[PDB]
Amino acid sequence: MNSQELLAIAVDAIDNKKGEDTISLEMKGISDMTDYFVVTHGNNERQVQAIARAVKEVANEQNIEVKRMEGYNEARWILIDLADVVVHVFHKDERNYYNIEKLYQDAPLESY
Amino acid sequence: SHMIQQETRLKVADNSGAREVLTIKVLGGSGRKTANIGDVIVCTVKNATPGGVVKKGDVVKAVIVRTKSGVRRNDGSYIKFDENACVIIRDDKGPRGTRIFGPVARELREGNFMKIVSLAPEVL
């Protein structure tokens, strides 16, 4: 599959665990490392860990290898590299600190 | 023009408050004393910016993100940078700061520093 339908899958998994304020950024013009950045958050450290696992699971289930999970234990910012698509899961109180959206304020943003 | 080892000074390339560190130890199971891109080091903050979270004298870990004695890719490409630079990191490898300054080498993604990659303006 192509990154667009991989994107579509990841946001479904995120919406499944009630991911808040979930957005995607098109990184094609802006980066060689990936095509999309997904940004979403949860309200507690369990929900951020669950949204991450949900992204892993629904990506396994279609046989995509989650390449790495970063900061899964601490559950503040969990980065799930699917390579074509990179999913950032943030604790509610951490998202605004990093403000990924405003760092790439010229990337095509889509919200859900 | 020379490699990174104990007692070598490095610019900090993030908003952590640290501006310049002093290496005290290269980490890594090889026990070897050279650090390059993607290596974690221990260092003491020798210069800091007022109002930052990280203050002079603190002991921190940092990942090397630019080396002026560069490394060669699987590609046969050899990349180099004009300066040595690192990024202060937490224990789980997430950046202490929230912003990265200048170019970082793409090896960080394989190092599991993909958070630093995602914040960096330029990836070489």
Author numbering:
A (entry chain A): 1 to 112
B (entry chain C): -1 to 122
Text from the published report:
Unlike HPF, the mechanism of stress response mediated by RsfS is conserved in bacteria (but it is also found in the mitochondria and chloroplasts); nonetheless, the knowledge of its mechanism of action and interaction with the ribosome is very limited. In this work, we uncover the binding mode and describe the detailed interactions that the stress protein RsfS establishes with the 50S ribosomal subunit in S. aureus using cryo-electron microscopy and X-ray crystallography.
Importantly, the primary contacts between amino acids such as Arg97, Arg107, Lys113 of uL14, and Glu70, Asp81, Tyr98 of RsfS are conserved across bacteria. Overall, the uL14–RsfS interaction pattern seen in the crystal structure agrees well with the one identified in the cryo-EM structure. We speculate that such differences at the solvent facing side of RsfS are probably due to the fact that this region is, to some extent, flexible in solution, but stabilized in crystals.
